Scaffold this active site. Structure first.
Site, PDB file in Angstrom:
ATOM      1  N   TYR A  57      -7.970   6.289   1.247  1.00 48.32           N
ATOM      2  CA  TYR A  57      -7.309   7.127   0.229  1.00 48.32           C
ATOM      3  C   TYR A  57      -8.173   8.337  -0.137  1.00 48.32           C
ATOM      4  O   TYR A  57      -7.723   9.252  -0.840  1.00 48.32           O
ATOM      5  CB  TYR A  57      -6.968   6.344  -1.052  1.00 48.32           C
ATOM      6  CG  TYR A  57      -6.002   5.196  -0.874  1.00 48.32           C
ATOM      7  CD1 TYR A  57      -5.392   4.943   0.356  1.00 48.32           C
ATOM      8  CD2 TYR A  57      -5.692   4.361  -1.944  1.00 48.32           C
ATOM      9  CE1 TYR A  57      -4.512   3.881   0.508  1.00 48.32           C
ATOM     10  CE2 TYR A  57      -4.815   3.305  -1.801  1.00 48.32           C
ATOM     11  CZ  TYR A  57      -4.226   3.068  -0.577  1.00 48.32           C
ATOM     12  OH  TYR A  57      -3.362   2.000  -0.435  1.00 48.32           O
ATOM     13  N   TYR A 218       3.458  -3.402  -3.415  1.00 51.10           N
ATOM     14  CA  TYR A 218       3.089  -1.999  -3.345  1.00 51.10           C
ATOM     15  C   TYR A 218       4.340  -1.129  -3.426  1.00 51.10           C
ATOM     16  O   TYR A 218       5.450  -1.636  -3.259  1.00 51.10           O
ATOM     17  CB  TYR A 218       2.163  -1.682  -2.159  1.00 51.10           C
ATOM     18  CG  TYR A 218       2.751  -1.521  -0.757  1.00 51.10           C
ATOM     19  CD1 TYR A 218       3.751  -0.592  -0.482  1.00 51.10           C
ATOM     20  CD2 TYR A 218       2.220  -2.240   0.311  1.00 51.10           C
ATOM     21  CE1 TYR A 218       4.238  -0.422   0.817  1.00 51.10           C
ATOM     22  CE2 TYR A 218       2.689  -2.070   1.607  1.00 51.10           C
ATOM     23  CZ  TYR A 218       3.700  -1.167   1.856  1.00 51.10           C
ATOM     24  OH  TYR A 218       4.147  -0.996   3.154  1.00 51.10           O
ATOM     25  N   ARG A 278       2.645   8.355 -18.233  1.00 53.02           N
ATOM     26  CA  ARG A 278       3.257   7.355 -17.358  1.00 53.02           C
ATOM     27  C   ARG A 278       2.333   6.172 -17.094  1.00 53.02           C
ATOM     28  O   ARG A 278       2.794   5.047 -16.960  1.00 53.02           O
ATOM     29  CB  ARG A 278       3.768   7.989 -16.061  1.00 53.02           C
ATOM     30  CG  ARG A 278       4.953   8.932 -16.309  1.00 53.02           C
ATOM     31  CD  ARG A 278       5.579   9.445 -15.030  1.00 53.02           C
ATOM     32  NE  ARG A 278       4.771  10.458 -14.351  1.00 53.02           N
ATOM     33  CZ  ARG A 278       4.841  11.765 -14.587  1.00 53.02           C
ATOM     34  NH1 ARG A 278       5.669  12.232 -15.515  1.00 53.02           N
ATOM     35  NH2 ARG A 278       4.075  12.607 -13.897  1.00 53.02           N
TER      36      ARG A 278
HETATM   37  N1  LIG Z   1      -1.000  -1.561   1.443  1.00 51.34           N
HETATM   38  C1  LIG Z   1      -0.245  -0.537   1.864  1.00 51.34           C
HETATM   39  O1  LIG Z   1       0.106  -0.248   2.988  1.00 51.34           O
HETATM   40  C2  LIG Z   1       0.246   0.335   0.712  1.00 51.34           C
HETATM   41  C3  LIG Z   1       1.333   1.255   0.928  1.00 51.34           C
HETATM   42  C4  LIG Z   1       1.845   2.111  -0.133  1.00 51.34           C
HETATM   43  C5  LIG Z   1       1.215   1.987  -1.386  1.00 51.34           C
HETATM   44  N2  LIG Z   1       0.091   1.038  -1.608  1.00 51.34           N
HETATM   45  C6  LIG Z   1      -0.626   0.882  -2.930  1.00 51.34           C
HETATM   46  O2  LIG Z   1       0.423   0.760  -3.915  1.00 51.34           O
HETATM   47  C7  LIG Z   1       0.291   1.823  -4.919  1.00 51.34           C
HETATM   48  C8  LIG Z   1       1.667   2.092  -5.400  1.00 51.34           C
HETATM   49  O3  LIG Z   1       2.591   2.717  -4.513  1.00 51.34           O
HETATM   50  P1  LIG Z   1       2.916   4.110  -4.241  1.00 51.34           P
HETATM   51  O4  LIG Z   1       1.876   5.006  -4.864  1.00 51.34           O
HETATM   52  O5  LIG Z   1       3.299   4.357  -2.905  1.00 51.34           O
HETATM   53  O6  LIG Z   1       4.125   4.147  -5.164  1.00 51.34           O
HETATM   54  P2  LIG Z   1       4.817   3.826  -6.561  1.00 51.34           P
HETATM   55  O7  LIG Z   1       3.678   3.325  -7.359  1.00 51.34           O
HETATM   56  O8  LIG Z   1       5.959   3.008  -6.300  1.00 51.34           O
HETATM   57  O9  LIG Z   1       5.337   5.229  -7.176  1.00 51.34           O
HETATM   58  C9  LIG Z   1       4.568   6.196  -7.453  1.00 51.34           C
HETATM   59  C10 LIG Z   1       5.270   7.541  -7.749  1.00 51.34           C
HETATM   60  O10 LIG Z   1       5.913   7.286  -8.971  1.00 51.34           O
HETATM   61  C11 LIG Z   1       5.512   8.207 -10.022  1.00 51.34           C
HETATM   62  N3  LIG Z   1       5.552   7.413 -11.247  1.00 51.34           N
HETATM   63  C12 LIG Z   1       4.642   6.499 -11.687  1.00 51.34           C
HETATM   64  N4  LIG Z   1       5.026   5.919 -12.877  1.00 51.34           N
HETATM   65  C13 LIG Z   1       6.203   6.538 -13.123  1.00 51.34           C
HETATM   66  C14 LIG Z   1       7.059   6.327 -14.245  1.00 51.34           C
HETATM   67  N5  LIG Z   1       6.896   5.506 -15.254  1.00 51.34           N
HETATM   68  N6  LIG Z   1       8.263   7.120 -14.244  1.00 51.34           N
HETATM   69  C15 LIG Z   1       8.580   8.027 -13.234  1.00 51.34           C
HETATM   70  N7  LIG Z   1       7.756   8.208 -12.174  1.00 51.34           N
HETATM   71  C16 LIG Z   1       6.526   7.439 -12.127  1.00 51.34           C
HETATM   72  C17 LIG Z   1       4.172   8.708  -9.559  1.00 51.34           C
HETATM   73  O11 LIG Z   1       3.924  10.028 -10.050  1.00 51.34           O
HETATM   74  P3  LIG Z   1       2.770  10.318 -11.147  1.00 51.34           P
HETATM   75  O12 LIG Z   1       1.442   9.828 -10.586  1.00 51.34           O
HETATM   76  O13 LIG Z   1       2.860  11.835 -11.288  1.00 51.34           O
HETATM   77  O14 LIG Z   1       3.143   9.521 -12.391  1.00 51.34           O
HETATM   78  C18 LIG Z   1       4.320   8.726  -8.033  1.00 51.34           C
HETATM   79  O15 LIG Z   1       5.009   9.886  -7.546  1.00 51.34           O
HETATM   80  C19 LIG Z   1      -0.445   2.941  -4.076  1.00 51.34           C
HETATM   81  O16 LIG Z   1      -0.874   4.041  -4.927  1.00 51.34           O
HETATM   82  C20 LIG Z   1      -1.472   2.066  -3.370  1.00 51.34           C
HETATM   83  O17 LIG Z   1      -2.515   1.729  -4.311  1.00 51.34           O
HETATM   84  C21 LIG Z   1      -0.387   0.223  -0.563  1.00 51.34           C
END
Ligand SMILES: NC(=O)c1ccc[n+]([C@@H]2O[C@H](COP(=O)([O-])OP(=O)(O)OC[C@H]3O[C@@H](n4cnc5c(N)ncnc54)[C@H](OP(=O)(O)O)[C@@H]3O)[C@@H](O)[C@H]2O)c1
Length: 325
Positions: A57, A218, A278
């Site tokens: 990351y 995730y 958020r």
């Molecule tokens: N193991 C793997 O292969 C894998 C794959 C994908 C993700 N992950 C892990 O999982 C975490 C989470 O997934 P992800 O980042 O893909 O997605 P997510 O957490 O499902 O969504 C994140 C998106 O949502 C926004 N957001 C957050 N809270 C919000 C709220 N209350 N209302 C409206 N929008 C909101 C964020 O923007 P803002 O930051 O501007 O709030 C960002 O654009 C990652 O960051 C990582 O640590 C692991």
């Protein structure tokens, strides 16, 4: 049961994991330096005690800076914080496993991580490029040997460098490969996979529960919807009619509804936000609960369509998403 002050759930190795954590992936080029550190600090102030990160990351040093600062000021002790790191595809050769974990420990400037997981079941060509591609844009793969990689992970726990071992993006077959390994010392305690109301993981969840493996969801809010790698065929999860309707009932946002949904079923959630408001919003999920009929109706939103398909890697022998689960 679960509360802001106490929401850790048991892992099969005797450790425990906070049922909500802060995700920390953010597009490198479009994210201000320091944003991750600031967010981790705010999360800990808010009550988060679980941070999900990965060396690839490119901000793991910010994660460490924040955690260490909060420990230094006495906000938490090391034992109060749960950090999960990940072993990337280019680092799966057994001899590379411990040095890879050691790099992450040096980057965090911490003695151990709470959870270390195989990031994807696919091995890529070892080297300096996290995404090995040749001149023809071709992906340079490497032959996976999951059981051998796992043995190297096991030695890391034996050395005291990591408390718990797990995996990510593993399907049932790949899970069984490890679970049935001759001489298995440490079974996987966690499988981190895409999970939310549009992809509820019904079969994989049942299978994991059978083996006392906790699912970490995730992209629990349905991703940032970056078209570069996200399947944007499905409409935005947070705009879902039912999720928003249920939100009105509890005076909660759709995001809060979808997070509550997963934690209420024993699924760890790791929503990412680098936004002050958020970050706080996502944590306020302990002051209400969904009725059984509400839980049923939310689960029924399942589309069996992934936001995270990773199509570029469909031809790697260990691509996890060909199988049903
Ligand atoms: N193991 C793997 O292969 C894998 C794959 C994908 C993700 N992950 C892990 O999982 C975490 C989470 O997934 P992800 O980042 O893909 O997605 P997510 O957490 O499902 O969504 C994140 C998106 O949502 C926004 N957001 C957050 N809270 C919000 C709220 N209350 N209302 C409206 N929008 C909101 C964020 O923007 P803002 O930051 O501007 O709030 C960002 O654009 C990652 O960051 C990582 O640590 C692991």
């Amino acid at each position: 049961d679960l509360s802001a002050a106490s929401h850790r759930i048991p892992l099969s190795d005797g450790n425990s994991i906070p049922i909500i954590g802060l995700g920390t992936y953010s597009e490198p080029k479009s994210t201000p330096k320091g944003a991750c550190a600031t967010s981790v600090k705010v999360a800990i102030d808010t009550g988060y005690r679980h941070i999900d990160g990965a060396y690839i990351y490119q901000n793991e040093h910010e994660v460490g800076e924040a955690i260490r600062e909060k420990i230094a000021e006495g906000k938490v002790r090391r034992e109060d914080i749960f950090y999960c790191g990940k072993l990337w595809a280019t680092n799966h050769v057994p001899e590379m496993v411990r040095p890879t974990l050691e790099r992450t420990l040096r980057v965090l400037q911490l003695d151990y991580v709470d959870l270390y997981i195989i990031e994807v079941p696919m091995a890529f060509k070892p080297g300096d490029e996290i995404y090995p591609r040749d001149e023809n844009g071709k992906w340079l793969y490497h032959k996976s040997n999951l059981c051998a990689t796992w043995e190297a992970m096991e030695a890391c726990k034996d050395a005291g460098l990591v408390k718990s071992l797990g995996v990510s993006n593993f399907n049932r077959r790949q899970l069984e490969l490890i679970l049935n390994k001759p001489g298995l010392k440490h079974k996987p305690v966690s499988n981190q996979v895409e999970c939310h109301p549009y992809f509820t993981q019904p079969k994989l969840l049942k299978f994991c529960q059978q083996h006392d493996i906790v699912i970490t969801a995730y992209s629990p809010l349905g991703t940032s919807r970056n078209p570069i790698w996200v399947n944007v065929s499905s409409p935005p999860l947070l705009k879902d009619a039912l999720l928003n309707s249920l939100g009105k009932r509890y005076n909660k946002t759709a995001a809060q509804i979808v997070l509550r949904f997963n934690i209420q079923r024993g699924v760890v959630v790791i929503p990412k936000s680098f936004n002050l408001e958020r970050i706080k919003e996502n944590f306020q999920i302990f002051d209400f609960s969904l009725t059984e009929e509400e839980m049923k109706d939310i689960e029924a939103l399942n589309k069996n369509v992934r936001f995270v398909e990773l199509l570029m890697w469909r031809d790697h022998p260990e691509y996890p998403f060909h199988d049903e689960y």
